[PDB]
Every structure is written in structure tokens, then in C-alpha cells.
Design a protein around this ligand. Structure first.
Ligand SMILES: Nc1ncnc2c1ncn2[C@@H]1O[C@H](COP(=O)(O)OP(=O)(O)OP(=O)(O)O)[C@@H](O)[C@H]1O
Ligand SMILES: Nc1ncnc2c1ncn2[C@@H]1O[C@H](COP(=O)(O)OP(=O)(O)OP(=O)(O)O)[C@@H](O)[C@H]1O
Ligand SMILES: Nc1ncnc2c1ncn2[C@@H]1O[C@H](COP(=O)(O)OP(=O)(O)OP(=O)(O)O)[C@@H](O)[C@H]1O
Ligand SMILES: OC[C@H]1O[C@](CO)(O[C@H]2O[C@H](CO)[C@@H](O)[C@H](O)[C@H]2O)[C@@H](O)[C@@H]1O
Ligand SMILES: OC[C@H]1O[C@](CO)(O[C@H]2O[C@H](CO)[C@@H](O)[C@H](O)[C@H]2O)[C@@H](O)[C@@H]1O
Ligand SMILES: [Mg+2]
Ligand SMILES: [Mg+2]
Ligand SMILES: [Mg+2]
Ligand SMILES: [Mg+2]
Ligand SMILES: [Mg+2]
Lengths: 215, 124, 123, 216, 126, 123, 123, 121, 213, 123
């Protein structure tokens, strides 16, 4: 019973159109919820609500405070690669090197003479979009939380890297942790425990992959 | 249904230009994130260049600045302009696309791949 | 400060498609909220679409909603406007502007402006 | 998002000396604003130090739900950029970040720099004003997502105009649903408080609502 | 009763010096923060310099190093020493103080403002 | 014989746009550098923006990104596109040009100035 | 390793003028020798004009000499091509290219290339 | 840019000596031309002595020449004024000032000023 | 000081000569103005004095101490002071005098760190600020001959007037200077004037001789 | 290492006031616990007041409590002592000292010392 949403509705602006209308779902401990939908459906807004950045006008949200959020939009702080990944968290080599492996970063990092000690600027203009996205995801999965909110992390990644990361990181490395993935890929949806399809703030579908297949 | 058809490959001299083209045909509601990939003999398939629907592009370090990925959303076509070719670029070039079939009730994508294009760059 | 330069304008057949680009020269491009604005002959500068520095927030004018798409590339210091299914109403000089203040769509909050590009549509 | 309770709490900084806090009692409900007023040396900071566990009570009991963000009386800046100073090991969210800056009256100052939030702070890069330093320190504290916010005299080195804007848009609007303990002796601030604790030489001289304080 | 009275203003030439003074009179139990603010025509009121009871000072970037804020806690007076005056400093200077009235049972403050003092930096001066 | 004529000035509200124009008339063999300068009350005359024959532009820090200098070499005209006007931009705007008169046997220039255009930004 | 993007192409009547721009995104722009190249229908990519890294050296194709002008702005990471007095012969796809090696006009020495812009000169 | 604070003032009998100090708080102290200025009651601020950022150039008012000495310590961000063989004429408020412009002794060229110290002789 | 007799040179063997039969004699402490159309061969003439261009015919004579100011400003990574002094030893008087003359004092004093602000991974200056720093560096170098190739090219007419009058004319008053300029305002103050057009010398003489149309 | 220099001493009538200043020359001023100490002639150095590096902790001698106030300005590298309602007992040489070890009021813990200033309280 890790994440629970009951008749939840919220608005970004008072008196406006609700960004999310009567949202219901229950994600059990260690399950994978896939959040699909059209552009502007309210997917990020739903994650913003779980984070407490969006307050519901009506309904109730229940979860344990330990949340790690991966943005759609990569952000890299000034400092080394290691500084960016480990961040506020303490350093454990097994966890660090396992996360690098899972997030397809080992080859890129080893290409540099200074390895993880290479200094990045702000925004990581030196790195590629994919390298930036991988560092951002690595940082998020390196944070030890009870819930992982991954908002479209594979957006600027090639299909081959995305396949490796989804299989070895989202599915293998984070297997026992409750996680919410914003994705509209069938390839990802097949591996989901439950699927939420949003369209214009409303829940168009909620159920298993087999239930979605039967439509 | 939906098919991806690459064209533009061949045997060229080093320093030559080449334009690969890959068009999506069939019942397509929308296409998201098309890209180009390459596989040299014995080695594994890897990215060359990727392009979002909106037009944001990413490149492999080896091709960045030399190759240019572009797309015509009206024609559902992705293009790889390959300039200053090196014998290191010799490989089979594959085209990828995240396509939503019209038949699908929701805006969900499926991964489609091309048959491949052989590009061979000779030193002489 | 940031120096903006638009490109991609011209003449198009109705229901057509056109893509505008705007490259910014200067520091901290990610701090600026980028916006596309149109000035119709005789009319004032109207807001078309906006992007937050991150790219996380995108807002469009009701008239262009569902047809126009605003995007950003902070690594390339560029902002784009994909204008699909164009109508003769969209004929105007398209301006690209930067705002150093967070989240407004009113052109009054945008300090840095480009030269503009003429975009004409005929039925 | 917490409950703050104190029952007959007394504590000493030095063994066998004078108690810094004598018989303190209060209950702050979820999302409420407690104003802690008093003369210099009253024991206000010491009360916050106790909530943080840095001061152990000799007698009495304290209850709260952890996840506390503390804003010091004395501004501190780490070497690095403005962004580095505000986010401080907390995951970055543009909306939250840019909203906190707006609320803490930092947007205008930051936009005055060509490098904006990427300007390097400390001796190496730049020297900010007392007010700029205080605003960055408060921004950092309000950026941290906690259940309880302990704000020890943050407006101390701020002008009355900026303080008014920050109190109204940050303390009252931005953090409206979060439990807050604000160390302030200003009536302007006290009128907006849910409960008020007035300390004098370690002792509680007043505890109640603004209306109860008005009736004195 | 609390009254804040500014003095020292006037018409001066550019480069001139000037000392503004503002004294708190009436039933004052204590004062903790005092400051000088200015409002130029058409523009909004802004800070110039602020001073804590203990004497810690902050300044506007435009005045830092040129202007000096000081206070006499015995006299309940704040002072602004204005050096190397520029025509940009032409404005109405207001005095502010966080005062505890003798009537208050606790050490609680209220914001008090002066009526202002005009400072004009121009060649119209002697 | 050779003259610089400014136009486009006036009284505007803050945030308004304005386009100053300055045309070189008479016997002109060629023009090398063109620029916009301003003089606010009590302050000294200073550059706003300058433009080389080839089109390279420089700006004052205060106007960079907000103002845009352009030139039509065919029309012998320099333009100052003034966006997001502030009451700090109120001044007299002067136009300058390094002109070679048709009478000169060699490619040697002379400095020419305009009479000035008053720009007043109200708040 | 610079990413090049051209703009400014289109249709023009003979004797007309057009200005092409090319922004490069990447490090050490000043190291690169920038060049404009044209690909006529049926023909190979031919050299048009080149600029050295700092702009001290400019070279042009005999055909365009006296009509075309190459310029650079290292601060804005852009290279420009001013095409005056156009002839129908100049109809081609104009490419902007960067060379990491000093002083060659041959397109074989240019590693980084842009998408190109079509320029059409009618009569 | 620089905050100045003088010290060392007070009462002395004629023929006596006094040493004034002035510490600067801010960046690039060495860029500034430091100067000592005096303002007698009823008189304007008059120049006394000046030091270039380096300390290479020292200039004194004709009245104080041979009796007063200006010195600098860039490591300690301080400027000093040794006033020997004092006359009752030297009674004035001594100010310490910084100029961001090279080589002027006119107090009009000095932007940053200290509070001043009263010297009685 | 500087002499050129029947000098001709080519950049490419079997091409068109960049400079054709150039003649001039510049005495010690004199100001030679080099005017001409774009591509006339002005920079190429200075390149020849530097030894970067070898004459095919003719002779060039001069004293080795040369300080050259490029048309194109260049800035090294480091502080403003680091950029102006460069290799040369530091003298406060010379330094602060050069800054004043080159209209840099006001810009430098606008920064809190003054001349110690890092330039090039650091602040970006305007075209004019860069041109002024480049000229300052050149005039700070103590040489017998100063080759100033179009230094005022990216400067506004007001700054250029101040710099020409106080730096080129006042500060450098006793040094031999070759100034590449096509401005009448500058030409009036020249000792001798050389006008180039397509590698050829169209005029060589005094301002009075040039005035006599 | 830190070099300390006191100022503000002199002669005053009883019931009067005096403010002492002490500027520190050296690195990491904020690390040091600053203190004011007084040496009565033919008496041991006595502690007067102390302030932590932050300024968060201030301690005073019982004799001076309620009359003296210790303050700090880390930006100006100075520590101050406001001595109000002075008694003839306060006549001593006031020293300023720095301690690299946290929170002790004993002068034995302070390594760096100033020259001192004589304070004389008459009547
Ligand atoms: N921080 C915000 N403040 C105010 N309004 C917002 C904010 N974020 C989003 N919105 C608005 O609410 C809507 C929610 O869109 P949202 O980003 O949640 O959809 P989405 O599924 O995440 O879209 P996408 O697939 O593009 O990420 C948007 O249309 C937007 O205008
Ligand atoms: N960490 C500490 N260790 C020992 N004594 C301390 C400590 N902190 C404070 N004290 C002492 O307790 C009292 C300080 O109380 P405190 O500083 O909390 O009051 P305050 O209301 O915060 O004062 P102010 O308004 O000046 O911040 C003083 O007697 C001080 O010496
Ligand atoms: N290093 C070089 N190698 C070969 N040719 C060069 C070199 N530098 C310049 N040239 C050529 O020599 C000719 C003379 O150009 P030059 O640099 O002297 O122009 P200029 O007289 O200085 O005028 P401007 O500087 O205004 O362009 C030009 O055709 C130029 O391309
Ligand atoms: O702009 C309003 C602001 O309020 C939200 C909603 O809860 O979140 C704020 O609340 C926390 C306190 O729990 C603040 O510290 C945080 O900075 C705010 O973001 C969110 O909509 C908005 O950011
Ligand atoms: O100097 C004593 C020090 O110890 C206290 C005791 O409450 O607080 C500590 O608490 C934890 C131990 O659980 C330490 O890890 C932490 O760093 C200390 O703050 C407090 O009096 C003092 O800080
Ligand atoms: Mg989203
Ligand atoms: Mg406190
Ligand atoms: Mg760091
Ligand atoms: Mg040249
Ligand atoms: Mg160096």
C-alpha cells in the first residue's frame, strides 16, 4: 500500500480548468506503475502532487516521505561527475559503480583520462544530451528512497541505450523498490504492474497490461 | 501496416558526402523520436544520431559536427547527411522510429526498425 | 544580456507548415523564459508560445493551441517554433523574446527581443 | 506537516548553572505559525536548539515528527554558485527553485549579474551585501522540503521594505501549509501568527493568540 | 507617543558632503533597527543604509563606501553621513525605526517612519 | 552637400518599442562606420550602438540585447530598433557616419553628425 | 567539433541581394577557418568564400569576387555571407563549413558541415 | 567598493606628534589612490597628503611638507599619516579617502570617504 | 628610422603582387598614416616590416624594436593587468598612464576586482573593451617603432577621438608610429601620408600636399 | 595567523561611554573566537567579553555585564566593544585577542594579541 490516491483533483490556478480530475490508484510496495498519455495530459503534474509541489483541492494522497525524483529535463551542477552523481548522499563504491553500470555510464566515464573526476560546468554543455540524461538518472537512482518518480527519463536517449537502462536499471536494479514511470512505450508498458493512462487531466485507463491488451 | 525504408547507401571514397533517407509508410497516427544507428562487422549496434519530433538532436561523439540528422514531419522521413566520410564510418546503417499506428486507441508508441543500408568508405 | 536572431520565415500555402528558429548569444541562456510573439499589420505584439529556462513549462495562445509547438536546446542556445496547419490569420512578423523573470506570457515582461521574421499565409 | 509539543521543559547550557529555559509549554498544530518573541538573550535560539536536539532538557518532554529545515540568525554561504548555495544537495526542480527565489526577493539581484545564478560566491568570486546573504540563506532553508521550518530572526539584516515583501509572499504565501516557528519581535509579524510565545530571561511571559495579546 | 524627526537636508552642489540626522522622541522603551530610505521623483522608495541596535550596518550598492550610517543609542538618533554627492542622490530621505513604546508590557516592536527630508544635488546650489 | 537626417523619436510609455532611422543624403562615394549615440540630462554623450560597413555591430552594456542596430547600404541608412524602453533611455539620440564625398579623389572619410532626435520614456 | 546551422536562403529576382548566416555551436570557434560552399544542380560542392579564425584572411571564388562578402563574429559564433548583385548562375544550395586546418579553400579540408540553404535567383 | 575607517585622533600640545591610521574594507585596495584630507571648522575639506596604489607616489600640502609623512601597507589594507611638530593650525577633522582614478589631489576626485577623526593642537 | 625603396612582394609565386613599387622614409619620432581601400595591401605592408612578408624586389631598413597592434583584438586567459603588461615588467606610472590614455580606467574601475578580474572562463568584454585592451598592451610595450593597424576599427567615434588625441598624439608623441587609418581627422595630424590602392602607391607626401587636391 | 589592531581608547568622565574597535589582518577571521581583555596596571590580564566566529555566542565578565556589548563584522574583519556607563574601575589597557580553539574565556587560550589601548575614567 506504498502509494494511494483517492478522488484526487487539483488546479494550478484558482477558478481555472483542473489539471487532474478524480484520480484513483493504489501502488503496492515494490510495484511499477506506468503513467502514459498525450502531451499536456497532466502526467508531470501528477508527480508534482506526489512531491507536494501541487496541493489537491479535493481528495487524499498517502505515501512514505522517502521520494527520489528524476526530471524529464536533465540538470547538471558545477563539479565532477562523481560530485553530480553522489550529491548530498554518502559514498558507497558498490552502489556507485553498480549504478554507473546500470545507467550505461561506465564506457563514457572511462573515455575521459580523469574518469569521474572530470569537471563539468553548469548544464553540462561539454556532454551530449544522452550523457546529461544518464548522469541525471544515475543521480536519482543513487539516492536511496522508498519511491522513485521517473518522469520521461529516456526522452533524449537512443532506443538501444534506453532498452539497456530500462532492463538493467528500472527493472533489475530497482526491482524491489516502488517506482512510477512516465512512459508511453508499449515495450515499457508490458513490464508494468499497473498502468495509468491520462488524457486532459482525466483517467482514461487504469489496470494491468492484460486488461489494456483486451482493448 | 507500417514500414521503414532506408535508401542512400553505397561505396564512396574517404572525404565524400552521402545522404541517407528513411521514410515511414503505412497507417501512422504520429511518429516520435526517429534516429539512425550503425553496426560495423562483428561489433555491436550503436547510435549515430537521434531526433525528437520537435527537432532536438543528439549525436555520437565520433559523428558530431560531421553528420547532420533532420526530419520532415509532413513526409514522415528522417535524413542523415554524412559529410567528410572516414573508413571508420563503414557499417550497416539502421533507421529507427517510435510509431503510433492509427489502429491504437491511445497515444502509445512501438519501436520500428529499417532493413539496413550498407555504407562503405574506401581509403582509395 | 542576450542577443536574439530569428530565421525560418517566408511565404506558405494554407494548411502548410513552417519552422522558426531563434539563436541567443550570451550567458545563462537557461535562466531566460523564451517566447514567440506575433505582430499582425496594424495590431499589437501578441503572445504565441513560451518555454521555461529548463523547458519544463510550455504555454500557447488559444488560437495556436494544438497546431504550434515550442521547443528548446540549451546546449545550442536555440528556441524553435513549429507552426503546422497554418491559416491566413497567422500572417504576422514573428518575434523571439527572452524574459529574466519567472513565468509570464505578457510581452511587457520580456526585455530582450529579436529583429523578427515575416510569415505570410494565402488561402 | 508536524505537531510541535513542549511540556514543562527546562534546560541548562552549563551544569549546576542558571537554566536557559524555565518551564516552557506549547502545542503547535500542523501547518500553524508560531511567533517566538523576546528581549536579547531571552533563550529564543536556545529553544530552537532544543527542538533540533542540540540542547537536552533537564526536565519536561518534547515531541515532533522530524524532517526539520532550520534557518540560522547568522547567514552562511558555501563556496560555489548561487544555485549551488540554494539547492544544497536537494534535487533540482525549476518551478520550486524559481518560485523560492521570487518569494525571497532574489530574482532582481540574480538577474543583475550576467552569469545570473551561476555567479561564483565566496572570496574567490564575489562579496554580497548582508541582505543578499540573508536572502540566499533563507532561500536555501525554504527550498529544503521539510515538515517543520525553524526560522530564527531571518529578517535581522534586511530593510523593512524587503522584509515586508518576504514575510507576506514567502513565510505567509509560499509556506502557508507548512508548520513554521518564526523568531520575531515585530507586531506586523505577530498579527499573522497562529500562536505567540514571549520569552524573557528563560521564562515564558506570554503564550496565546494575537487577540489574547491584544487584550493586554 | 512616538515621533521621528529628520533634519540636515537641503540643496548642495555635486561632490558636497551632508549629514542627515533623525531622532526618536516620546515614550520609547527601546529601539532596535534604524534605517535611511530614499524616494526619487516617479521612482519607488528604496533602502540606502540600515543599522542594528548593536551597530552592524548594511548599504545599497549605489551608496556603499560613499555614505556612512551611525547611531547614538543614548540620544535615540540615527545619522547618515553623505559624501561625494551625485545628482543621482537627489531624493526625499526617510528615516525608519522599530520602536518598543513604554506602554508595551513585552519587548515587541512597531514600525515608525519620518516625514522625510529633501536632498537636492544640483548647480542651483551655492 | 552631405547630410544626416534622424527621425523616429518622440514621447513613449515604458515598455514601448521605437525605430529611429538616420539617412545619409547628398554626394556619397561610400560610408564606412555608422553609429547611434545618446546624451541624457547632466550626463555626457556616449555610444548606444555602432555598425561597420560589413555589418559588425557593438553595443553599450545598458542597451545590448534590447536595442538592435542595422543598416541598408543601398539606401545609406542606419536604424536603431529600441525595444522594452525604460525611463533610463530618455535622452537625445545622435547619428554619426564616416562619409567619403564623391568629390574626394581617394577613399578618405569625414565625420558627419545628425541634429538629434529626442526620445522621452514616461513612467 | 562544431555544429553548423545556416539560414537566410530563398527566392530573389536577378540583380537582387541576400544575406546568409551560419551559427556554430561548440568550443574554440576562433580555431576554425569558416567557409561558404555552393552545390549547383548536377555539380559538386564548389568553394565560394573563406575566413580565417580571427578574420584577417578572406578569400573568394573568381565568379563571386566584388559581389559577395564574407564576415565573422566570434563573440556571436557566427559567419555571414552578403550576396549582392545576384545572377541566375548563383542558384545553388549554400553550405557553411568549418576547417580545423589552416588556410585551404578546398572543401576536402573542411570536416564540419551545415544542413545547407537553397538560394534561387529568378529573371 | 571600499569602506574606510580612521583612528588616532585626539588632543595634543603644540610641537607634539600624532599618528593616524585608516583601514579599508573591500576588494582591490592597491587600485586606489589613498589620501588624507582635513576640514577645519568654517573651512572646506583641504588636501593633506596622497599615496598611489603602489606607494610609489607621495604628495603633500605645502603647509604640512617636511612634518607629515604618508605611508601604506597593502597587505594590511591600511594607510597611515604621521603628523610631527604640530602647530595649532592643524586643528581639523582628518578624513581618509580613496580615489579610483590615477593621480589627483583634488578631494573632488575621491569617491570613498571615512567618518573622520578630530585632532586638537 | 623606417625606409622602403622600390619594394614589391607577392603572397603566392606567379600571382599578382600584393605591393607594387613602394617607396617611403619615416624619420625618428614621426607619424606615418597609411590609408587605402579594403584589400589595398596596408596590413601586408606592416607584415613586411615584421618580416612575415619577404620582398621579391627592393630594400627595407629599420631598428628591431617593434610593437605591433593588430586590426583584430586578441585576449589571453588571465586578468586585465596580465593582458596589458604581458611579458613586460610592471611600472605603476607607465601602467596607469597607458590605461588613462587608452580610455580603460572607467571600465576597469566599474569592476569590484578592478584590473584583477579574470578575462578571456571569465568575463566577456565588448568589441571596444577588447580593442582598448589590445591597444593598451601594444602601447605599454616599450619599442622604437609602433605599427598600429586600424586599432579604432571597432571603436565609437567619441572614444576613438579621445584615444587618438591622448594616446597616439600625446602619450606616444616622441616615438616613430605607423598608423593604418583612412580618417581625415587623423591624417591632418600625420607627418607623412601613404595612400595605397590595389598594391600601388597612389599618394605619398605631407597633409598640405594632400590638401592641394 | 591574524594581526590585531585596537583603537578608540582615551580619557572619559564617569557615567560616560566609549567604543573600541579592533581590525584583524589575516585569513579565516570567522574561525577565530574574538575577545576583549583588560590589563589594570599591576594586575593580571582579565577577560572582559568574547564573541564566537559566527557571532552566535557572546559572553561577558560579571563586572561589565549589562554595561558592555561585544559585536562583530566578519565582512570588515573587525570586532567592537561598546562600553556604556563607565566606572573608574574600568581604567585599564584594553586588548583585543583571537583564539583558534572553540569557546574558552581564558586569556591562556588566545594566541594572537593586539597592542592595546589605554582607557581612563576620571571623576
Ligand atoms: N508549474 C506549473 N505551474 C502552473 N501550471 C503548470 C505548471 N506545470 C504545468 N502546468 C500546466 O498544467 C498542465 C499540465 O501539463 P503537464 O506537464 O503535467 O502534462 P504532461 O503529461 O507532463 O505533459 P508532457 O508530456 O509534455 O510532459 C500544462 O498544460 C501546463 O500549462
Ligand atoms: N551553545 C551555547 N552554549 C552555551 N551557552 C549558550 C549557547 N548558546 C547560547 N548560550 C547562552 O544562553 C543565552 C543565549 O540565549 P539565546 O542566544 O538563545 O537568546 P536569543 O533570544 O537567541 O538572543 P538573540 O535575540 O540575541 O538571538 C546566553 O546566556 C548565552 O551565553
Ligand atoms: N598571410 C597571408 N597569406 C596570403 N595572402 C594574404 C595573407 N594575408 C593577407 N593576404 C592577402 O593579401 C591581400 C592584401 O590584404 P590586406 O590584409 O593587406 O588588406 P588591407 O590593405 O590590410 O585592408 P583591410 O585590412 O582593410 O582588409 C589580400 O588579397 C589578402 O587576402
Ligand atoms: O508557489 C507555491 C508553492 O507552494 C507549493 C505547494 O505546497 O509548495 C511549497 O511548499 C513548501 C513547504 O512545504 C515550500 O517550502 C516550497 O518551497 C513550496 O514549493 C508549490 O505549489 C509551490 O512551489
Ligand atoms: O557537544 C555535545 C553535542 O551533542 C549533542 C547531544 O544532544 O548533540 C549531538 O547529537 C548527535 C548524537 O545523537 C550527534 O551526532 C550530533 O552531531 C550532536 O549535535 C548536543 O548537545 C551537542 O551538539
Ligand atoms: Mg511533463
Ligand atoms: Mg536568537
Ligand atoms: Mg563545489
Ligand atoms: Mg588587413
Ligand atoms: Mg596565467
Amino acid at each position: 500500500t506504498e502509494v494511494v490516491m483517492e478522488n484526487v483533483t487539483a488546479f494550478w490556478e484558482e477558478g481555472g480548468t483542473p489539471v487532474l480530475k478524480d484520480i484513483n490508484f493504489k501502488i503496492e510496495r515494490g510495484q511499477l506503475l506506468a503513467v502514459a498519455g498525450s502531451t499536456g495530459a497532466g502526467k508531470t503534474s501528477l508527480l508534482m502532487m506526489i512531491m507536494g509541489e501541487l496541493e489537491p483541492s479535493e481528495g487524499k494522497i498517502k505515501h512514505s516521505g522517502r521520494i527520489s525524483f528524476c526530471s524529464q529535463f536533465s540538470w547538471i551542477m558545477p563539479g565532477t561527475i562523481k560530485e553530480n552523481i553522489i550529491f548530498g548522499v554518502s559514498y558507497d563504491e558498490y552502489r556507485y559503480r553498480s549504478v554507473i553500470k546500470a545507467c550505461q555510464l561506465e564506457e563514457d566515464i572511462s573515455k575521459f583520462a580523469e574518469k569521474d573526476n572530470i569537471v563539468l560546468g553548469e548544464g553540462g554543455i561539454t556532454l551530449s544530451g544522452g550523457q546529461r540524461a544518464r548522469i541525471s538518472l544515475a543521480r536519482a537512482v543513487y539516492k536511496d528512497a522508498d519511491l522513485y518518480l521517473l518522469d520521461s527519463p529516456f526522452g533524449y536517449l537512443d532506443v538501444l541505450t534506453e532498452k539497456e537502462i530500462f532492463e538493467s536499471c528500472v527493472c533489475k536494479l530497482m526491482a524491489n523498490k516502488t517506482r512510477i514511470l512516465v512512459t508511453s512505450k508499449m515495450e515499457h508498458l508490458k513490464k508494468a504492474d499497473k498502468i495509468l493512462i491520462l488524457h486532459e487531466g482525466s483517467s482514461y485507463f487504469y489496470g494491468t497490461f492484460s486488461e489494456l491488451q483486451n482493448l | 501496416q507500417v514500414q521503414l525504408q532506408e535508401s542512400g547507401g553505397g561505396l564512396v571514397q574517404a572525404g565524400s558526402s552521402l545522404r541517407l533517407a528513411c521514410a515511414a509508410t503505412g497507417s501512422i497516427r504520429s511518429i516520435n523520436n526517429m534516429g539512425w544507428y550503425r553496426q560495423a562487422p562483428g561489433k555491436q549496434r550503436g547510435m549515430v544520431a537521434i531526433i525528437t519530433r520537435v527537432g532536438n538532436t543528439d549525436y555520437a561523439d565520433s559523428v558530431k559536427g560531421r553528420f547532420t540528422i533532420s526530419r520532415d514531419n509532413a513526409k514522415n522521413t528522417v535524413y542523415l547527411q554524412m559529410n567528410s566520410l572516414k573508413p571508420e564510418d563503414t557499417a550497416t546503417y539502421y533507421c529507427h522510429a517510435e510509431i503510433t499506428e492509427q489502429s491504437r486507441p491511445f497515444y502509445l508508441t512501438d519501436d520500428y526498425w529499417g532493413q539496413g543500408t550498407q555504407v562503405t568508405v574506401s581509403s582509395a | 544580456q542576450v542577443q536574439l536572431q530569428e530565421s525560418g520565415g517566408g511565404l506558405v500555402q494554407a494548411g502548410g507548415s513552417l519552422r522558426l528558429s531563434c539563436t541567443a548569444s550570451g550567458r545563462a541562456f537557461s535562466w531566460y523564459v523564451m517566447g514567440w510573439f506575433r505582430q499582425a499589420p496594424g495590431k499589437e505584439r501578441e503572445f504565441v508560445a513560451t518555454v521555461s529556462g529548463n523547458g519544463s513549462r510550455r504555454d500557447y495562445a488559444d488560437s495556436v493551441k494544438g497546431r504550434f509547438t515550442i521547443s528548446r536546446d540549451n546546449a545550442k542556445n536555440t528556441v524553435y517554433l513549429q507552426m503546422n496547419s497554418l491559416k491566413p490569420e497567422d500572417t504576422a512578423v514573428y518575434y523571439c523574446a527572452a524574459s529574466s523573470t519567472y513565468y509570464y506570457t505578457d510581452p511587457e515582461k520580456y526585455d530582450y527581443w529579436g529583429q523578427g521574421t515575416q510569415v505570410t499565409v494565402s488561402s
